[PDB]
Amino acid sequence: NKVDVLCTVDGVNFRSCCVAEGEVFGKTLGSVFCDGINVTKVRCSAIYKGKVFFQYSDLSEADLVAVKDAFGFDEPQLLKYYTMLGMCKWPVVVCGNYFAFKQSNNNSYINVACLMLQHLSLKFPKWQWQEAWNEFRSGKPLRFVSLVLAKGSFKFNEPSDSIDFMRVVLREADLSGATCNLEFVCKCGVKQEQRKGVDAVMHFGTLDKGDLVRGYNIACTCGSKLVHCTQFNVPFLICSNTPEGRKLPDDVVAANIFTGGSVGHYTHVKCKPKYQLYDACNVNKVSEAKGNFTDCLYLKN
Amino acid sequence: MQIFVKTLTGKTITLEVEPSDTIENVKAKIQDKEGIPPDQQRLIFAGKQLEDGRTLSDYNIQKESTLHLVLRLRGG
Ligand SMILES: [Zn+2]
């Protein structure tokens, strides 16, 4: 008469829990997700035998620590995560070696951020992020997207910045070994700095890796200051800038394009073969890479 | 102490701050001078994005340093 299921808050530790058949799950379990669905108001049936129910109401102190360890979330973020998980049901389309999202709820910034991240080899210290990333790489990205949306300040159905999505992801990745050596030269003097982690693999102010290698000038109280990377030791590099209709720098693997003014629309181009242009779930071969580029990805090897 | 913020229009802003100020603090001050909501502001120091919760001292931002202000894009 009772169905045996597994209860968890973190997907790491589980306890057996029983629910009477025909009874609404929330009555005994509180708010619950099962296989990515909010089943709080679903009536218990034998089809759910042995399945895993993620709880997120009435979290104890010990539960909150487990959630922080596995998700990196506090309670409001966790609730935002499950809200996002319930709402973000965007169809995913496979385009050769990559996947893309149908246009929906102003998700172009997510689409092109995910198209760029599909080039990267990343590992995540937090269990839920690593597991969602494995599903992401298998072509099931919605759980990973929901983590990112909850971790950041993103609002569902609102147009946003693809660089913020990528940065939220990269701050969760293990980038312990990534560094770059910078030198700065102006009339103020000469200083060195070694950037690490996300600060080593993301650079804002130019799209062209060659600008970093050669040096390029930024504003300074003395007039201008040369910024020069004397050594790269990163697996990849994302150079970002205010959208500009410049020529695509050499050696770029993929780039994000932002079209419009205050509110706009993202597209994405890959350069192997030159070129594949993505717009939502459409992909077309084109002979030139043009548009107002805003993020450029470089890869080692 | 004074720091300077270069904007996309070309204008250079002068802020009065202490090394203990947070980036969130700096963004609030920018809103006061220019009216730009902090949630739209991206602050950069020599190519490095500056995170809200950290302080100027954490980033080695000293007197008369120049930051760059850009707006977050809104792509749907
Ligand atoms: Zn100088």
Radius of gyration of chain A (CA): 22
Q: Give the Cα separation of B9 and A250 in Å (integer).
A: 29
Distances (CA, A) of A117 to A20, A149, A160, A240: 44, 15, 17, 14
Q: Does B46 touch chain A (CB under 8 A)?
A: yes
Q: Position of tokens 């009477």?
A: A20
Q: Give the Cα separation of B4 and A222 in Å (integer).
A: 12
Whether residue A167 and residue B70 make contact (CB cut-off 8 A), yes or no, is no
Nearest Cα neighbor of B21 from B47, B59, B69 is: B59
Q: Give the Cα separation of B74 and A243 in Å (integer).
A: 12
CA distance A255 to chain B (A): 15
Q: Give the Cα separation of B29 and A270 in Å (integer).
A: 40
Distances (CA, A) of A213 to A142, A164, A222, B41: 37, 25, 23, 28
Q: Give the Cα separation of B41 and B28 in Å (integer).
A: 10
Write out the H or E segment, with its range, that includes residue B27: helix B23-34
Whether residue B76 and residue A225 make contact (CB cut-off 8 A), yes or no, is no
Whether residue B49 and residue A202 make contact (CB cut-off 8 A), yes or no, is yes
B2 DSSP assignment: E
Q: What is the resolution of this structure in A?
A: 1.9
B6-25 residues touching A, CB cutoff 8 A:
6, 8, 12
Q: Position of tokens 């939220």?
A: A168
Q: Where are the domains of chain B?
A: 1-76
CA distance A128 to chain B (A): 24
Burial of A246 (0-12, 13-18, 19+ CB in 10 A): middle
- Taking any CB pair shorter than 8 Å as contact, residues of chain A touching chain B are 106-109, 112, 153, 158-164, 167, 182, 184, 193, 195, 199, 202-206, 218-221, 225, 227, 242-243, 258, 260, 262-266, 294
Q: Does B70 touch chain A (CB under 8 A)?
A: yes
CA distance B29 to chain A (A): 20
B54 DSSP assignment: S
Residue A99 in tokens:
């996947």
Residue A56 in tokens:
């997120």
HEC per residue, chain A: CEEEEEEECCCCCCEEEEEECCCEHHHHHCCEEECCEECCCCECCHHHCCCEEEECCCCCHHHHHHHHHHHCCCHHHHHHHHHHHHHCCCCEEEECCEEEECCCCCCHHHHHHHHHHCCCCCCCCCHHHHHHHHHHHCCCCHHHHHHHHHHCCCCCCCCECHHHHHHHHHHHCCCCCCEEEEEEEECCEEEEEEEECHHHHEEECCCCHHHHHHCEEEEECCEEEEEEEEEEECCEEEEEEEEECCCCCCCCCEEEEEEECCCEEEEEEEECCEEEEEECCEEEECCCCCCCEEEEEEECC
Write out the H or E segment, with its range, that includes residue B68: strand B66-71
Regarding the domain delimited by A179-299, which CATH topology (the fold level of the hierarchy) does it fall under?
Jelly Rolls (2.60.120)
CA distance B75 to chain A (A): 5
Nearest neighbour of B46 by CB, restricted to A112, A184, A202: A184
**What is the β-pairing status of strands A236-244 and A202-204?**
parallel
Q: How far is CA B19 from the centre of its chain?
A: 13
Nearest Cα neighbor of A4 from A40, A39, A53 is: A53
3-state secondary structure of B75: strand
Q: Which residues neighbour ligand 1 (ion) by CB within 5 Å?
A: A 186, 188, 220, 222, 225
**For residue A174, how many other CB atoms are within 10 A of its CB?**
13
